[PDB]
């Protein structure tokens, strides 16, 4: 039952490999995951056949609670531009009113 052997071996090593990394390395690094996984899987499957896979993670879902916290970052980064633009508007308005008063 080759299928079960490969499935259990890969589901084995994925857990540990992703556990020694942070969430943002899980987002950008692809070569490292591959090399670390094959460094074990190749020795495990040497008696049979190659694991050429380039193991992919097709999708990484956090639950509903974490998504709000994750996109609050970019929402906050957006508010900064609006705040600065409003400040510039205020500055120019005040200068013009000062000229009128003079």
């Amino acid at each position: 039952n080759l299928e079960l052997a490969i499935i259990n071996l890969t589901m084995t090593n994925i857990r540990t490999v992703l556990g020694s990394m942070e969430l943002d390395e899980m987002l950008s690094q692809r070569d490292s995951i591959n090399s670390r996984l094959l460094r074990i899987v190749d020795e495990a499957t040497n008696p049979w056949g190659i694991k050429v896979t380039r193991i992919e993670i097709r999708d990484v879902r956090p639950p509903a609670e974490l998504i709000s916290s994750m996109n609050a970052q970019m929402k906050a980064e957006r508010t900064k531009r609006a705040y600065i633009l409003e400040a510039e508007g205020i500055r120019q308005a005040e200068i013009l009113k000062a000229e009128g008063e003079k």
């Binding site: 591959n34 090399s35 094959l38 460094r39 190749d42 020795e43 040497n46 190659i50 050429v52």
Partner: protein, 76 residues
Amino acid sequence: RRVREQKHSDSHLNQRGQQLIGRRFVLESPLVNGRGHMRVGDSSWPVSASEDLGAGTHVEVIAIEGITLHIRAVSS
């Protein structure tokens, strides 16, 4: 009689292990205890050599056992 010494397109078609024989590569990590891993394509393959070889040496494949590749140093 026709197949041997005459036709080789299908012989080299569907066997990868014999394809890798004779190719040349370079090493990025030194072999410890005469065994390690080497990058091929976008993946890695296990390699074994007679003597410890340092990082950055030109190597050439000789034979295949299981999925392990025998490599030896070759001058440029």
